[PDB]
Amino acid sequence: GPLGSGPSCRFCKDDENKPCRKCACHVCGGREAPEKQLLCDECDMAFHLYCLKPPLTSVPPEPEWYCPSCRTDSRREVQSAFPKRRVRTLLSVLKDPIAKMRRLVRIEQRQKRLEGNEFERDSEPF
Ligand SMILES: [Zn+2]
Numbered sequence: 001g002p003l004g005s006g007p008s009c010r011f012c013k014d015d016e017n018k019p020c021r022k023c024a025c026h027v028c029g030g031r032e033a034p035e036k037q038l039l040c041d042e043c044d045m046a047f048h049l050y051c052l053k054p055p056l057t058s059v060p061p062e063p064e065w066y067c068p069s070c071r072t073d074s075r076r077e078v079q080s081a082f083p084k085r086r087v088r089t090l091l092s093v094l095k096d097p098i099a100k101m102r103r104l105v106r107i108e109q110r111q112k113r114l115e116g117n118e119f120e121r122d123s124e125p126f
Pocket residue numbers: 009010011012013014015019020021022023
């Protein structure tokens with residue numbers, strides 16, 4: 001059967017007016033509540049509080065959060081005992097048109113340049 005076409009994003013290229021796994025929820029590939037999704041700290045990808053995890057329905061109080069694969073893949077060894085900040089969320093990013101476009105262009109370029117690195121990987125783009 002035929003494939004979809006339209007104005008294309010640069011990490012999923014499906015449609016800029018539609019939700020994706022990297023534009024919206026990485027776990028359902030959609031958007032419904034843009035005020036109940038978490039962001040990784042390595043990928044900055046969205047994750048519904050009710051798609052990403054079965055137990056809790058609310059965002060943690062801690063200083064950093066990465067996707068459940070990244071958090072299992074030894075990126076940090078332990079939970080934090082000091083509240084330096086709270087984790088990143090769409091209720092913060094998606095609730096601002098600049099934080100939206102910054103996470104969608106600025107972050108997408110951060111990872112997409114690393115996927116085809118022109119120099120050593122410690123290039124400090126952020
Ligand atoms: Zn996309």
